[PDB]
Scaffold this active site. Structure first.
Site, mmCIF file in Angstrom:
data_model
loop_
_atom_site.group_PDB
_atom_site.id
_atom_site.type_symbol
_atom_site.label_atom_id
_atom_site.label_comp_id
_atom_site.label_asym_id
_atom_site.label_seq_id
_atom_site.Cartn_x
_atom_site.Cartn_y
_atom_site.Cartn_z
ATOM 1 C CD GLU A 28 -3.079 -0.552 0.010
ATOM 2 O OE1 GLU A 28 -3.180 0.640 -0.340
ATOM 3 O OE2 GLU A 28 -3.772 -1.458 -0.493
ATOM 4 C CG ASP A 39 0.897 9.923 -5.367
ATOM 5 O OD1 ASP A 39 1.586 10.161 -4.352
ATOM 6 O OD2 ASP A 39 1.337 9.293 -6.354
HETATM 7 CL CL LIG Z 1 -4.817 8.854 -2.451
#
Ligand SMILES: [Cl-]
Length: 187
Positions: free
Chosen positions: A75, A88
């Site tokens: 992950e 992100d």
């Molecule tokens: Cl994310």
């Protein structure tokens, strides 16, 4: 809706490891299980910082700590891939990337509280696959639960092709192989 994951054993789960897409994240020439093991190894020093917490969380939840480590490696690369704990797009939180849109996040991103939350979410997905496919071998239910951590229980529709539709087309295969590798490191 009782839980009943106490017989599950990650060492009995079959795996084909990482897809070519996934292996490319570390520009590996290795393939499959070998690639998963190398991806895991690249995350080991960081993972070891969290090993005491991961072990405690696994013990407190009746789940192999090695599985938690496999999830964390996949992950977040044991935190390396995160920005103050965030993925992100600012939706995934923590070492295990709990989705803040689906859950009220708890704990710091690198905390025991966080690792417990992600672990509980995985354990619930395992329960659901056991409920949805009650005749399956427990190994397949465990693997399906892991796949559901990425793609949802709704993505687990048939015995075959479970990782189709998961990120990389390999989520549970890769996580299982990484988990087995961490188990051999003493997780
Ligand atoms: Cl994310």
């Amino acid at each position: 809706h009782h839980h009943h994951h106490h017989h599950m054993d990650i060492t009995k789960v079959d795996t084909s490891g990482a897809s070519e897409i996934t292996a490319r994240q570390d520009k590996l020439t290795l393939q499959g299980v070998d690639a998963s093991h190398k991806l895991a190894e690249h995350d080991l020093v960081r993972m070891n910082k969290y090993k005491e917490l991961i072990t405690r969380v696994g013990q407190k939840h009746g789940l192999d700590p090695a599985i938690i480590a496999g999830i964390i490696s996949r992950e977040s690369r044991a935190g390396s891939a995160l920005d103050h704990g965030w993925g992100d797009h600012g939706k995934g939180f923590g070492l295990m990337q709990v989705d803040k849109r689906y859950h009220k996040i708890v704990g710091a991103w690198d905390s025991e509280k966080h690792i417990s939350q992600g672990t509980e979410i995985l354990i619930e997905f395992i329960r659901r696959i056991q409920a949805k496919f009650p005749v399956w071998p427990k190994e397949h239910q465990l693997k399906g639960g892991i796949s559901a951590y990425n793609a949802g229980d709704k993505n687990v529709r048939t015995y075959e092709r479970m990782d189709v539709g998961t990120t990389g087309g390999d989520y549970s295969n890769d996580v299982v192989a990484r988990s087995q590798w961490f188990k051999s490191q003493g997780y």
